[PDB]
Amino acid sequence: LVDTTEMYLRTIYELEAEGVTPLRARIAERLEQSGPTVSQTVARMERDGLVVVASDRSLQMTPTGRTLATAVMRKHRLAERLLTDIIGLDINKVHDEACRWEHVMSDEVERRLVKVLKDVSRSPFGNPIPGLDELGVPGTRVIDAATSMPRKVRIVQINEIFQVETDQFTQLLDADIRVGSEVEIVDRHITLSHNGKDVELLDDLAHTIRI
Amino acid sequence: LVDTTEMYLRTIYELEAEGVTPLRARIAERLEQSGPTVSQTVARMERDGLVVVASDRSLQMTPTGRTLATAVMRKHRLAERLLTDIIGLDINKVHDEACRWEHVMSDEVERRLVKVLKDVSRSPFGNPIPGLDELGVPGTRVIDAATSMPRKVRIVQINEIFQVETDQFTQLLDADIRVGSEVEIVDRHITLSHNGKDVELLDDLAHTIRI
Ligand SMILES: [Zn+2]
Ligand SMILES: [Zn+2]
């Protein structure tokens, strides 16, 4: 949904990308927000650890704020591609519309757009689409990547290098569950099935394996 | 963008459509909002002339609130059609996603979706898509339908029945500008061109003609 923080972060991202210094006055102007409101909002973002105001007053996005800012521009640009390539909305309206959509488009839709769209390297306005690497178009912890629904998936990593107990190593081996192997998953404990065999994992494995 | 008013109105629309009485407790429940917050928000909507609480405490949307509620469900359902038919998002996520998109999708995009989608009669979940008539998929007053950009358009009505001064009647006739005739338009006064001839309209005509 629509976020002010997300709006400030994408503004800083833009200026930076344009080659303009992230000053509170340029942001305020771009955002069409008063000066006092921006320092008010920026003071909040600092406390959240999303931005830090440097000596020269310019705003430096922390790694966390930079990641968020980048997902917003990716969503934003992926949206524009959707609006021009498929929907066919008037090119003069595509940016305005995408400015709102960037706050409501989920990562799952982005991934789909990456599959559906012919080319995702640039927005219709000549700018590159950032964060695609991070979008995932390594993986997700089985614990937080599986639900009561026995969805399929693919092994990106097992992470047996970080395992202390190795008793289920052969289990995975028997059930032919390796890296790059599509497998099912249901969180009811985590039991990733494959090769017709179910594997009810232990805390640790569920924490390290990425699907 | 995301509106609480729009959220309350679509909730009332749903219950009503389900055959449930628009009571503040069902809304609160559905919205997962406390009781006190809903009366707080509903008291606001009444003042806005969007809803009226009846004797039996149930909520009756005024014509204005009903129109708004309907556009939201239309946007919402048009969105779902876009998510399933084209984007291909997991069907179990389509409603959640559309719940957010309904607040950010403009009418212009809806019209496009109406052109692009194979069928807009029902949402993927079996419910009819309302308000298509009102979406416009009669017209828009040339005054508020033309800008500095000489966009094309189509005459839906001239409204000469409501004219007091009839001096430009023949002008329109000469320039072969009738109902169903595609014509250009630029608001810099309103001058709808057609048949290679420009017609700089007067206040009244600009107010009644719909493109
Ligand atoms: Zn843009
Ligand atoms: Zn829905």
Curated annotation (Swiss-Prot), chains A, B:
Listed under subunit, the entry gives: Homodimer.
What is the organism of origin for this protein?
Corynebacterium diphtheriae (strain PW8)
Free-text function comment from the UniProt entry:
Iron-binding repressor of the dipheteria toxin gene expression. May serve as a global regulator of gene expression. Represses ripA under iron excess.
Q: Which family does it belong to?
A: Belongs to the DtxR/MntR family.
Top-rank taxon, per record? Bacteria
What Gene Ontology terms describe where this protein resides (cellular component)?
cytoplasm
UniProt entry keywords in alphabetical sequence: Cytoplasm, DNA-binding, Iron, Repressor, Transcription, Transcription regulation
Q: Does the keyword DNA-binding apply?
A: yes
Give GO MF terms, alphabetically: DNA binding; DNA-binding transcription factor activity; protein dimerization activity; transition metal ion binding
Where it mainly occurs, coarsely classed, is cytoplasm
Protein name per its UniProtKB record: Diphtheria toxin repressor
